[PDB]
Amino acid sequence: MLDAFAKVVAQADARGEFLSNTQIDALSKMVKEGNQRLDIVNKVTSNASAIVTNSARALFAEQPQLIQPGGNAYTSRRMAACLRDMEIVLRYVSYAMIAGDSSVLDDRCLNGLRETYQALGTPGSSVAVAIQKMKDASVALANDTTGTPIGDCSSLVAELAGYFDRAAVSVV
């Protein structure tokens, strides 16, 4: 686990180099973004229960065969384990958003998650549908004003969409 600032230092140390002036200014504008990054993380954790339980409700409506007897999410424990995995992935994606780096997300959330779902028999293509339903439920909740000053957050919301896409290809 290393953030976006330590990712630059880890690359410079293997070269034996100081950080040049064009690299410090690329890091001084990450500080300038700053408050806009913490506004995104505040908005996806304050609604973190609503992101999971709405995207789950919209996943068994499109795929009703998951909750039929014989489906992978039919029982009390198999339904609660379905909502559990979505909260874990959403937790680690917000860790990578506050870090600026997807290192913590694939260190300890995505390593072996694909081979876990093959062992259990869980359809990993339907798990990817659930990550994408949590993606746009939190992308749309990032770019609404609602107590924030007006400005451009377009590069940070594109960064947050990249973590949801990385988790959705590392699962199937």
């Binding site: 290192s103 694939d106 260190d107 590392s170």
Partner: peptide
């Protein structure tokens, strides 16, 4: 993808390894 298993992503030890002393990761 990710790092290989066990490797803390970003703390690899083969970043700027010389080629003359490089050892292929099993």
């Amino acid at each position: 993808q990710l790092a290989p298993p066990g490797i803390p992503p970003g703390e690899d030890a083969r970043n700027n390894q010389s080629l003359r002393q490089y050892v292929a990761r099993p």
